């Protein structure tokens, strides 16, 4: 390929492996992703893409709360997609690794970019399907959170979900004991999970059975509020979960700072 130079990589595992890039067009920072044909379990179509392709089409509009696909690629034995790479940045994952659990003002502005960036996805008819903290880029001059690896995702619809590829220890109990969940509720599930590791610097179960007795223990000092909206996210029953909605009107989540200020506040 001449459009783009090729950097470090940046990472590989089963999102298949990534490299930082820069466009040569106008050296915009990219991030190109190789994914193999034999490892896509799952083809959509818009002439036969991964799934993920045509979820990122789906939501690679405008709003900046996800990664955008700027273009794709087909070889002879993968898919090679463009994304959008902010620069400087740090996964949730490796920044939660350093810093340990975050202070609750810093965790409510994260967690309500994920919220609003999981919004975008179902009002664009797409389940994410692993969210987790390896998934979500902060743009370290900005504080914007972005979300990545769409490749476990589907279409959202309304009946029952009976697949699943995500991370099991964010997977509700739901799909534990019966193989079963719908989109939303399974979502908000994960989304209890990945609030509890940015509270307590840990996710909180690492065993089906402590999945499934959903019994959450605080390890480090959180508010009552916060501990309130982790344990509505992680209800056992899919229907006693918070709404988006529902999440957001939360206590807990009230006076969230813009991104912006709590990339001076928190990252410099
Ligand atoms: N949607 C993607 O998997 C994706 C998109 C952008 C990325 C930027 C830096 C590091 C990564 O692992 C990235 N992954």
């Known amino acids: 390929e001449s459009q783009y130079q090729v950097g470090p990589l940046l990472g590989s595992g089963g999102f298949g492996s990534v490299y930082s890039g820069i466009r040569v067009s106008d050296n915009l920072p990219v991030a190109i992703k190789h994914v193999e044909k034999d490892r896509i379990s799952d083809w959509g179509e818009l002439t036969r893409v991964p799934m993920e392709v045509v979820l990122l089409k789906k939501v690679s509009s405008g ?83 972005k979300l990545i690896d769409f490749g476990s995702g589907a279409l959202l619809k309304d009946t029952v979900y ?45 065993h089906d059975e402590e999945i499934i007795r959903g019994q959450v223990f605080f390890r480090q000092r959180v508010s009552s509020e916060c501990q309130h909206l982790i344990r509505w996210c992680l209800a056992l029953r899919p229907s006693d979960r918070p709404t988006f909605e529902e999440i957001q009107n939360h206590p807990w989540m009230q006076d969230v700072l813009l991104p912006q200020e709590t990339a001076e506040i928190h990252l410099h």
């Open 63 to 145: 709003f900046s709360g996800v990664i955008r696909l700027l273009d794709w690629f087909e070889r002879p034995d993968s898919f090679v997609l463009i994304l959008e790479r902010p620069e400087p940045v740090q996964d949730l994952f490796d920044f939660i690794t350093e810093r340990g659990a975050l202070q609750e003002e810093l965790a409510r502005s994260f967690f309500w970019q994920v919220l609003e960036a999981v919004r975008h996805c179902h009002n664009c008819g797409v389940l994410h399907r692993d969210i987790k903290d390896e998934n979500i880029l902060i743009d370290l001059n900005r504080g914007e959170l």
């Open 162 to 206: 009976t697949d699943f590829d995500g991370t099991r220890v964010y997977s509700p109990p739901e799909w534990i004991r019966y193989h079963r969940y719908h989109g939303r509720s399974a979502a908000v599930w994960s989304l209890g999970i990945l609030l509890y590791d940015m509270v307590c610097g840990d996710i909180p179960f690492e």
